Amino acid sequence: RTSVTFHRPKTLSKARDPKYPRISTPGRNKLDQYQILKYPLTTESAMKKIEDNNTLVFIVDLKADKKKIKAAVKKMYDIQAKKVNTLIRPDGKKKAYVKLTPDYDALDVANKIGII
Amino acid sequence: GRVIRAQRKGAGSVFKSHTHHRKGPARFRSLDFGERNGYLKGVVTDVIHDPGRGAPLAKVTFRHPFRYKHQKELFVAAEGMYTGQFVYCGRRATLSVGNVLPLRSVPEGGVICNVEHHVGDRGVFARASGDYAIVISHNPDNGTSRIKLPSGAKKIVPSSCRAMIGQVAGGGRTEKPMLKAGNAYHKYRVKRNSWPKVRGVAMNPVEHPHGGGNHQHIGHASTVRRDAPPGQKVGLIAARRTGRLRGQAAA
Amino acid sequence: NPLFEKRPKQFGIGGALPPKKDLHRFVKWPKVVRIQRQRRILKQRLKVPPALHQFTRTLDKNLATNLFKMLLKYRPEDKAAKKERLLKRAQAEAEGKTVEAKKPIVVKYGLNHVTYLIEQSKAQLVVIAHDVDPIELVVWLPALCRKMEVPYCIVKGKSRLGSIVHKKTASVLCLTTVKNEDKLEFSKILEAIKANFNDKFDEVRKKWGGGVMGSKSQAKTKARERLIA
RNA sequence: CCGACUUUGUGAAAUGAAUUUUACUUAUUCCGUGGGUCGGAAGCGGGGCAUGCCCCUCCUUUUGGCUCCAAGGCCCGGUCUUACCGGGCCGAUCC
RNA sequence: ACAGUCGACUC
RNA sequence: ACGGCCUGCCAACCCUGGAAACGGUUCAGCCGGAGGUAGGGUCCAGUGGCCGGAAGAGCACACGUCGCGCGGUGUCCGGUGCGCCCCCGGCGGCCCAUGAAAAUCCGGAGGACCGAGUACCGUUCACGCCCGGUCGUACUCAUAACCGCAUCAGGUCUCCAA
RNA sequence: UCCUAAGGGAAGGGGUAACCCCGGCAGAUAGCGCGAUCACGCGCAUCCCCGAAAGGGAAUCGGGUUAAGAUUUCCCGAGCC
Numbered sequence: 001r002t003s004v005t006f007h008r009p010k011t012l013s014k015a016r017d018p019k020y021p022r023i024s025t026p027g028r029n030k031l032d033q034y035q036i037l038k039y040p041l042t043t044e045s046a047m048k049k050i051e052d053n054n055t056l057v058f059i060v061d062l063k064a065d066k067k068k069i070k071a072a073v074k075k076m077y078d079i080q081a082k083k084v085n086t087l088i089r090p091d092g093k094k095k096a097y098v099k100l101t102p103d104y105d106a107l108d109v110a111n112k113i114g115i116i
Numbered sequence: 117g118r119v120i121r122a123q124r125k126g127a128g129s130v131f132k133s134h135t136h137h138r139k140g141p142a143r144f145r146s147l148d149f150g151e152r153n154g155y156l157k158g159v160v161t162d163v164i165h166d167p168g169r170g171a172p173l174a175k176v177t178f179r180h181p182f183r184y185k186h187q188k189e190l191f192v193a194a195e196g197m198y199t200g201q202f203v204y205c206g207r208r209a210t211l212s213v214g215n216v217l218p219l220r221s222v223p224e225g226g227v228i229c230n231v232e233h234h235v236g237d238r239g240v241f242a243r244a245s246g247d248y249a250i251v252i253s254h255n256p257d258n259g260t261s262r263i264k265l266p267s268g269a270k271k272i273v274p275s276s277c278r279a280m281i282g283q284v285a286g287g288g289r290t291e292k293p294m295l296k297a298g299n300a301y302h303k304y305r306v307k308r309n310s311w312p313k314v315r316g317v318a319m320n321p322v323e324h325p326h327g328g329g330n331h332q333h334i335g336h337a338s339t340v341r342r343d344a345p346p347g348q349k350v351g352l353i354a355a356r357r358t359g360r361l362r363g364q365a366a367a
Numbered sequence: 368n369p370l371f372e373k374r375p376k377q378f379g380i381g382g383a384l385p386p387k388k389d390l391h392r393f394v395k396w397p398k399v400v401r402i403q404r405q406r407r408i409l410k411q412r413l414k415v416p417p418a419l420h421q422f423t424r425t426l427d428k429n430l431a432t433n434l435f436k437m438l439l440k441y442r443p444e445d446k447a448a449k450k451e452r453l454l455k456r457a458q459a460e461a462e463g464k465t466v467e468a469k470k471p472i473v474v475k476y477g478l479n480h481v482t483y484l485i486e487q488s489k490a491q492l493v494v495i496a497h498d499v500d501p502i503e504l505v506v507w508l509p510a511l512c513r514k515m516e517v518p519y520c521i522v523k524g525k526s527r528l529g530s531i532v533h534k535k536t537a538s539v540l541c542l543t544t545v546k547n548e549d550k551l552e553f554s555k556i557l558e559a560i561k562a563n564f565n566d567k568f569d570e571v572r573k574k575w576g577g578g579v580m581g582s583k584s585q586a587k588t589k590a591r592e593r594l595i596a
Numbered sequence: 597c598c599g600a601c602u603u604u605g606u607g608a609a610a611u612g613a614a615u616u617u618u619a620c621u622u623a624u625u626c627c628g629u630g631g632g633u634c635g636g637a638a639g640c641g642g643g644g645c646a647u648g649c650c651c652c653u654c655c656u657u658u659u660g661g662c663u664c665c666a667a668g669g670c671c672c673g674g675u676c677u678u679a680c681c682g683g684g685c686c687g688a689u690c691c
Numbered sequence: 692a693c694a695g696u697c698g699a700c701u702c
Numbered sequence: 703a704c705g706g707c708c709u710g711c712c713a714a715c716c717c718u719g720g721a722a723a724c725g726g727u728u729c730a731g732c733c734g735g736a737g738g739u740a741g742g743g744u745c746c747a748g749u750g751g752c753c754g755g756a757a758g759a760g761c762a763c764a765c766g767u768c769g770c771g772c773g774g775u776g777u778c779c780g781g782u783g784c785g786c787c788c789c790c791g792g793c794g795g796c797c798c799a800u801g802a803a804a805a806u807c808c809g810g811a812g813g814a815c816c817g818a819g820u821a822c823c824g825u826u827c828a829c830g831c832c833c834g835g836u837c838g839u840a841c842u843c844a845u846a847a848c849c850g851c852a853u854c855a856g857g858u859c860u861c862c863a864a
Numbered sequence: 865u866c867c868u869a870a871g872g873g874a875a876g877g878g879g880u881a882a883c884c885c886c887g888g889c890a891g892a893u894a895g896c897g898c899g900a901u902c903a904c905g906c907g908c909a910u911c912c913c914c915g916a917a918a919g920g921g922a923a924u925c926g927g928g929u930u931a932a933g934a935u936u937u938c939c940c941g942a943g944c945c
């Protein structure tokens with residue numbers, strides 16, 4: 001040996017392959033789109049945002065992030081979000097402002113579900 | 117009573133050393149084959165003030181013996197050292213101020229500082245500003261030497277104990293009057309919480325043996341025995357004599 | 368050719384960096400290594416009493432190869448070597464209605480078994496490993512075999528005895544009876560063993576081992592005593 | 597603070613019929629390291645006025661530069677087989 | 692050492 | 703804001719040259735054969751100037767028309783400082799006091815190893831393409847939203863300042 | 865949010881009847897890091913976590929807009945990491 005210092009020799013670690021699964025039942029996706037998008041908001045402030053800013057206001061799950069909101073609005077309503085802005089409301093629910101890419105029309109999206 | 121001020125210092129709490137701005141320990145470099153059997157060349161790079169200490173410190177940069185890197189040590193500077201100086205460490209080093217040699221390489225009468233006590237302790241003696249030791253004698257049938265310490269005591273130490281030639285720099289510091297409570301305040305701010313001091317006679321009996329009384333006085337002999345319990349050993353501990361020093365006892 | 372040139376390095380005490388030599392002597396090992404090495408060293412320094420220093424005098428390599436040749440002949444029946452015969456004797460019992468297998472002759476092992484054979488005097492050669500830990504298991508065997516007048520040897524390596532019987536370690540072996548084909552070879556082996564072991568017993572019981580100091584100590588010892596001379 | 601016992605082993609002397617003294621290293625205690633050169637013998641130079649057999653040396657003092665992963669030699673062994681890889685020691689003293 | 696223009700401040 | 707171009711403070715630095723009859727210099731210092739004065743350059747700061755942004759904005763006027771209409775005019779010129787706020791530069795003084803660390807980023811020494819020229823090895827350049835998660839964010843900050851049993855003459859850390 | 869300050873917690877170990885108390889005491893210290901993958905090599909030094917909405921620190925400006933949000937989160941334009 002040249003070094004005076006004895007280090008820990010490195011050995012093999014074998015990976016896990018258990019003889020029975022600790023979980024048989026699969027995972028349901030409990031935050032699916034209907035959990036993510038609960039219901040659109042119909043406050044007069046929101047109805048302004050539809051015309052003036054091409055925007056849609058939803059009440060969303062408290063555990064949904066901006067990315068999943070973008071995905072779920074494409075599966076449901078088959079549209080595109082240019083930008084999603086969120087805030088957790090003073091009473092505990094999360095509100096998402098969805099801006100549609102300028103292809104789609106927010107008013108026509110508003111009509112196809114019924115808000116205006 | 118209650119736990120007196122002298123007893124409170126051993127717990128550490130507010131009485132720990134004030135060392136946030138200190139520059140690291142000051143010592144020799146770990147003794148190796150290079151210094152036992154020859155000499156290692158170092159260059160002094162900076163002379164720096166170390167807070168809480170009167171001796172300046174010298175940053176000496178050595179080249180590593182067997183690794184491709186520098187080794188940056190920190191000495192107590194001897195008076196005379198300067199930046200750009202080449203200091204030399206080892207067994208075959210010349211007898212020059214700032215060099216570190218073992219005491220077997222130092223003639224009697226030499227002035228030395230930062231002297232080791234065990235071979236390799238990296239410096240224990242004559243480390244305050246303007247302090248030195250003197251080599252008195254060698255005894256070659258033991259490998260030991262007798263030096264005089266700053267206190268005047270004569271210690272027998274091995275002939276391999278290393279020392280730096282000269283005296284510690286910054287001498288003469290304590291000859292200047294301080295003149296001000298404020299100057300004492302800044303001196304101790306960077307050392308430890310030991311200032312100011314309230315006289316025990318000015319305390320109440322509950323917190324000091326000297327406290328209390330209708331006049332401030334001790335009321336008992338201020339010399340206390342060596343084996344007195346803590347909390348009782350205040351005053352002049354195990355004193356052999358008191359009073360003003362005259363004649364032989366001042367010598 | 369004229370380009371190829373030599374740049375010798377001045378590998379001095381202040382010169383060029385030294386190369387990668389072997390520092391196997393100064394390596395700081397783990398504790399398990401550290402303690403075991405000191406264990407043999409401390410054994411060296413202390414005075415070993417006779418009963419424990421009666422080991423440290425093992426049988427030779429020349430005789431061990433002779434003895435272990437015999438033991439390898441009398442290895443017990445292997446695990447596999449044991450199930451077919453019980454399979455075979457099924458038919459001899461099930462149809463022939465006789466067990467006819469005759470006395471298989473092999474070495475005997477296991478400390479309690481060998482001690483039993485010794486005290487009944489059915490033992491003819493005892494084989495004690497030098498490296499039993501805890502040692503108290505065998506310290507008294509030399510005395511018991513000497514008192515009961517059975518030749519005994521101290522071979523080197525309990526792991527080797529275990530190899531004969533198909534175990535990991537064995538710590539003792541004894542041969543009770545040899546076949547009529549090996550009387551001469553067996554007899555010659557045990558003649559030296561009695562001389563080597565059962566003859567010196569009453570002067571090795573008063574020999575104290577240990578007390579060997581360290582290398583640097585001995586080199587210092589000689590210098591000190593030479594100046595006396 | 598003080599003594600005995602325990603830890604606690606080893607062997608030598610002087611007064612004694614126990615007491616101080618000493619010596620060993622492995623217990624223990626302390627110190628230093630990124631456990632990085634320890635012990636013994638060699639070698640190299642040096643001092644010779646018993647060619648002693650011994651002592652003193654160990655390839656860095658110089659101006660605030662730089663300093664690693666070896667050049668070089670020998671030897672196996674492959675291959676192109678008519679041009680290219682693996683290896684071993686020396687360099688870096690031995691035990 | 693002049694001519695021109697400008698100039699806020701102090702005694 | 704940001705992008706260029708200019709300018710180049712006070713320092714620092716470079717080249718030529720060789721200083722007494724010493725000179726250069728500050729409010730103060732200080733500097734010079736270890737190279738001053740001089741002459742000529744480099745770099746640095748900028749919250750400095752021009753252009754782009756950008757007049758299409760904002761503001762002020764004046765008009766004229768039903769419904770976040772529309773149209774028009776302009777958006778200049780010098781000067782001043784023991785002034786005030788912020789920041790910066792560069793000197794000086796003080797200390798038995800010498801007044802954090804790390805993340806992060808940049809630069810260098812060395813040079814093992816590497817490729818074409820019917821073309822492959824590159825490249826810290828310019829342009830172009832995609833993406834940017836989580837939580838807070840309202841309001842008071844006090845002679846009424848904080849604490850003092852209150853909508854209490856108390857107490858409670860800051861920034862701007864005619 | 866990241867980093868460290870004073871300082872706190874902490875694995876092996878030491879103590880403890882136990883709750884708990886000790887971090888330098890040095891232990892194959894936790895984590896190995898880097899080049900590699902088509903595998904191996906090198907190196908391992910004072911070493912984990914927490915700790916600042918006034919310390920350190922990737923990047924934004926102007927103009928509009930509400931009953932109540934934005935001076936820089938929304939709209940318009942222009943940039944940057």
Ligand SMILES: [Mg+2]
Pocket residue numbers: 086087
């Ligand atoms: Mg948010």
Ligand SMILES: [Mg+2]
Pocket residue numbers: 309310311312
């Ligand atoms: Mg105080």
Ligand SMILES: [Mg+2]
Pocket residue numbers: 313
């Ligand atoms: Mg005083």
Ligand SMILES: [Mg+2]
Pocket residue numbers: 313314315
């Ligand atoms: Mg006082």
Ligand SMILES: [Mg+2]
Pocket residue numbers: 318319320
């Ligand atoms: Mg009082």
Ligand SMILES: [Mg+2]
Pocket residue numbers: 117321322324325
């Ligand atoms: Mg009292």
Ligand SMILES: [Mg+2]
Pocket residue numbers: 317326327328329331332333334335
């Ligand atoms: Mg009193």
Ligand SMILES: [Mg+2]
Pocket residue numbers: 329330331
């Ligand atoms: Mg009074």
Ligand SMILES: [Mg+2]
Pocket residue numbers: none
């Ligand atoms: Mg009185």
Ligand SMILES: [Mg+2]
Pocket residue numbers: none
């Ligand atoms: Mg000039």
Ligand SMILES: [Mg+2]
Pocket residue numbers: none
């Ligand atoms: Mg600018």
Ligand SMILES: [Mg+2]
Pocket residue numbers: none
């Ligand atoms: Mg402009």
Ligand SMILES: [Mg+2]
Pocket residue numbers: none
């Ligand atoms: Mg101010």
Ligand SMILES: [Mg+2]
Pocket residue numbers: none
């Ligand atoms: Mg200054």
Ligand SMILES: [Mg+2]
Pocket residue numbers: 839
């Ligand atoms: Mg807000």
Ligand SMILES: [Mg+2]
Pocket residue numbers: none
């Ligand atoms: Mg606000």
